[PDB]
């Protein structure tokens, strides 16, 4: 078995190779359609049933388009829908929101719509805009020129929402406080006086209507205020609009510094980072009550807080995970977690729990007594788990047919170790607790009796409720659509099933692709964005319908294509998915890129690309030619490339994910090496003497653990933005997988590569560290403090900084440098002949 | 000519080598005696004339010793003085750690001491505590260690900058939270004089200090103090007295704030620093005075704080920096050396205490006090000089006793006239000023200027008198001679000289040739101590007795008296370099050092490592012992590298025109000279392989290392750059504005001098650039390195990077230095010297 050595190109030549092979990927890296919305025409003469609206990128900016859904289709041919443009057209906190949401594309990111009026409302650039289409005013046949919402506000306006109750009114966040503006009457009004804009963030820590760093980064909740969907009518012929909102106080939260992007300044931004073990923000609910007269003039605003403290009414709650209003607008719901994230609660909150904010004790005491004792929080649902709660967006409340009962669908891993849908009915008891006594409530005084718990789905697979996945209820046919892994962990698919008499699960998407679906609000259409290992992504429209004899049974017909596939890329040879039975008692899946132009008898250098943390699955049946293109390029340059989804990865169950609880970094490489050896025993072109490992973020963490724990196997490790020290990562993430540092002294020690710098190799040209200098998430100090201890230990390293980058690489020049450095580093210290001589 | 390749040792092996060769230098890295002071015994029957006191390091802390100077010696033998400990054994803050960076102090212990002659009172800081002992006053001389006496305090924070009052040795003063305090060491009365700073407030809110030198003055002007005691005390009719303290008050409200990484990396926090970058404002500065009334037994009756009658901007037109300050011997006037922004216009200015009026906010009482001071009471510019190059600040400034009321007489040094720094006796007549304050107008550009009655040149020629880094002048007023250090005999050797300041001409050398010297004269001008060395012989401290022939006091003769510190004797594993010189096409002889590779093979050619500084204020090449400091240059020679060092133009100890060569033009002229001298060595010695040359330096050295890779990528294969200034706009005022001027008047100079701007001009080949930097560097902020990497990333150029996260501008932590040396040797091996390095292309 003679070793294959990779051709030794210069730095300039490799750049030209990377340039050339990336030259025809301009069209490939531009956003496919999203935020789909179906709206009916209601024109019995016209040829179109629906108009669909969607954000898309036609190198362009991201904007609203529309397309026409026909009443009928010529089934001989394949219809491709034409994209009509709907429209005709960063700060610090805008940049950070884009980092927390991981938004890469510039342009309009989202939009509210009001059905009754046809009003779009969207932020675009600095300004907020609004146009009507599809309501009373009908349907434009050409681009619309949008209307700028005017403002007296000096600073940037974030998080704009239409009022569902009255589309003339909108709300937004300005300088950490809630404002409202009327787009007809031009009336602006500040609803909250919490944050003084002029004061320092060290002095003034309170905000209102905003989600703090932890909730944005680890719970994907970006908004922190919620319009009440209905308006209560006054005797005056006016109305009351309500807004529930979170109010954070970050006074006791640690203040870290992060380098400012303006390197010119040599300055540092202040952040509130609650590191693991430290205080989270002190939270509470508030409600602004807004009285409007019979033609949109604000009579009065009354800001109102909870009758008792949050710590009393919601015992043991740390994070407000999700919140909103029930469809009727009667109750305010909230999904709530404890500190350890092992106990979830869904709680209804009557508006009568809130009372006027009054610093005077006489009036405050009279208001506390004026609210009845019967008015109480209602914990309609609770669950626990030995592993942890995975927050998701699935939660549907039904119409309230009885005063004393509520009915809803929620999802959970806590019964079976697999996320499934459950229809639940909770009795709303008058609480045992009485506020009159001047005592504090018992820990199960607000808990509702559970009348019904029908499991809608069940099995060795999961329903998806994150990254856009959710459910869609059809209340007429009493069905529910959802995405799942039932057919395979390697393929996401759309399914439907009755929530009444839950029988079999009818699959709707065709096997052999993975699907990202979305159902028309009128439950008569769905759009699938799908791909597979060989075929690029493509977005297609499918019409739903039922047999006359049984409306439960749904079937689908292809209607039209929204986005056509690009077709197979000339250079790109995709990888083969493989699986092997582990000694751990689990099937682990892998991907293998065989070297291109495979020589008989020879063995090749091997790059293990890895993420291996939670909330991620690299190995599945989607097209990897866009995102992991350079793994194919590595194959063309002679490297074997391996990717293995170890234990802890998602889409395999909660027990699979919980494998590394308290044990992070300790088990993941054992699976990687097992997968790497399964291939070596079954393919003799894998040179195990020359194996490299590389990854970003958690992948970078495991790259260090690989070279630390198993230097015998891995020759080189290239670690990108790694946590080298778990004590400087946030509460929300770390405490979920690792607990409090006092209750896991050994897990934290063993999981922190900075505490174990003595175990790194004393040969050079093995460790390479990459990091964004401006990283606010995996703060650079992870790399800087590891380097401090590597220097104490007398160990060698190589360092590459990206001074204009935060956690992700956004600037193309930076990404070009990275890809070029990585390719050259592997050539020089793994692949080439010079690399072998070097030892 | 076949190429020699260096033994390709492993990382673990090279650490062993560097560890083994470091091992037997425990004694070598220890501080020799310094801050010497002679005190007479005045004992007819006693065998000793003087007792010397000095700071020294007997891996010990720096502490006070004394030795006994005999009345006579046996001239057959060589007397070694015994080191007697003055002190008995004892029972870092942020501001200390910065001061040590500003003063460049490596060693631990007692840094300095004050001494009151009349009482024997020492005063010295050691740790946070401030201590005193008595020895050599009326009380007498101890034969045993003394117990250090802690000055007790009610101050919470570190007391910095203690100074003994020369008028009363019971009173001391110190800075505490940027304000001046005084404490009596007998009565224990402590007191706060200035109420300017609020310790509990953030520096962003409150940046007014009192009695402290701001960042630029400490870093660039080597003034580490902002208050000065008046040396005599005015007596009151009460029976007690007035003491006075001149002090600089600063206001850094308008100065830009940058953020430097905190050393505690765990916090992930940064500290706020007032860094006046080139272009931006320096602090608003002024003189103030604290008038301290004491009664008959040492109680403070009262304290009056006083300010200038008119603002500093009016009274001292043009003045940015207060460079030096203090009082005249009698205490009649306070003096001050004052520069303009461009640092091309120096002024010496006498300031009467009667210029200061009590501080008042009430406009009624304030206006009455302005009228009560006479119009004759005025600033007095006693000396002014200008220059097309710049003004190098120095400590040489001696005022004589004042006989005629209207006149004042002094010695001062200057490069401005001759082009080289020489001494000048000057007499100045003190006019009542033309400007009159009662008028209400403002003074014109030179209404305070004094008639120059005399300007005798005590020295002259193509060589400089030294007045920096501990060099100064001693003045025998009886015999009317002035002692000084200089380069008259050679630029490569410093020597002690003496000359008359009445009838100058002949300049008698006192130190022996063939060595460079660091000398120090007794206050009674009858002894001198020289710390001397040369390229071959380690440094050595000896005591010499001065004397004259009966007939002629001018004729000064020395005689060896005793050894204070004996030479360690040549280190067995050390070969010193050869000094060389060559005629440059610039019209200047440039010198250099040359370490040949050990066991030199005939016929084979060797890889070459040019080591560099090359900026102003320093000379690397001279006849001093380079065996301790530049030891690893020899370690490179032993591995089979040539090592070259050349002092290019703009260097040091060669006059102001030589230094001025790179005015407005930094980066541009230096690498020419380095390459010329390197090409000179190649044309003469054929063991120098020019196809494998590397450059390396720290700070300005690293700056030029980058420039050399940038400008001359044909000559230099690799370049290792340590803590470089990549971008001149980010460096401070006092330094940049001096050599490069304001950036508005010199865009092209800055552009060409800033490597970050010219990132495109770096090579596209990897394994050539290596950047090193202290991550906590407060002077050459890490941003220089980070922003350079920004544009190297943009340009798609490769680099190697090494960070030392515990270090500021110096490398203090031993583990950090060990790693730097290991990485440097291994980088040079794998990318320049070794065989595998050759195959790598
Ligand atoms: N707050 C978490 C969050 C998290 O762990 N996440 C999984 C990764 N995920 C992105 C992703 C990255 C790489 C990949 F290959 C696949 C997905 C992603 C997903 C969707 C999307 F649209 C854009 C990006 C975001 C959420 C964190 O940042 N660290 C970074 C880090 C680094 C070291 C150790 C622990 C952690 C923990
Ligand atoms: N503020 C100045 C100050 C200055 O220019 N100085 C000359 C150097 N000098 C030290 C020195 C360093 C290296 C060497 F080889 C010899 C001496 C020294 C002197 C006495 C001592 F005890 C210990 C060290 C201190 C004063 C500056 O720091 N930079 C750093 C820097 C870096 C790049 C470009 C310009 C400058 C300008
Ligand atoms: Na997020
Ligand atoms: Na200094």
Numbering used by the authors:
A (entry chain B): 48 to 105, 108 to 138, 148 to 897
B (entry chain C): 48 to 105, 108 to 140, 148 to 897
Task: Give me lines lifted from the publication on this model.
Here we present the development and application of the Aerosol-Generator (AeGe), a new gentle soaking device that complements the humidity control and uses ultrasonic vibration to generate aerosols of ligands to soak reservoir-free protein crystals. The AeGe technique uses reservoir-free crystals under a temperature/humidity-controlled gas stream. In other words, ligands are directly soaked into protein crystals without being diluted in the crystallization drop. Two protein model systems confirm the advantages of using the AeGe method in challenging complex formation scenarios.
We tested the AeGe on dipeptidyl peptidase (DPP8) crystals using two ligands which evaded complex formation by regular soaking methods. Both 1G244 and the E67-interacting loop (EIL) peptide (SLRFLFEGQRIADNH) are inhibitors of DPP8 and DPP9. 1G244 is a model for a water-insoluble mol­ecule and the EIL peptide is a model for a low-affinity binder: neither forms complexes with DPP8 using classical soaking. Regardless of the low nM binding affinity of 1G244 for DPP8/9, the low solubility of the compound in aqueous solution might explain the lack of complex formation with DPP8. A pre-filled capillary with 10 mM 1G244 in 100% DMSO was positioned near the active surface of the AeGe. As the humidity decreased, both ligand and DMSO were concentrated in the crystal. The crystallographic structure of the AeGe-soaked DPP8–1G244 crystals was determined at 3.2 Å. We identified positive electron density in the active site corresponding to 1G244 [Fig. 7(a)]. The 1G244 molecule is fully visible. Importantly, the atoms of the fluoro­benzhydryl substituent occupy S2, but also overlap with S1′ and S2′.
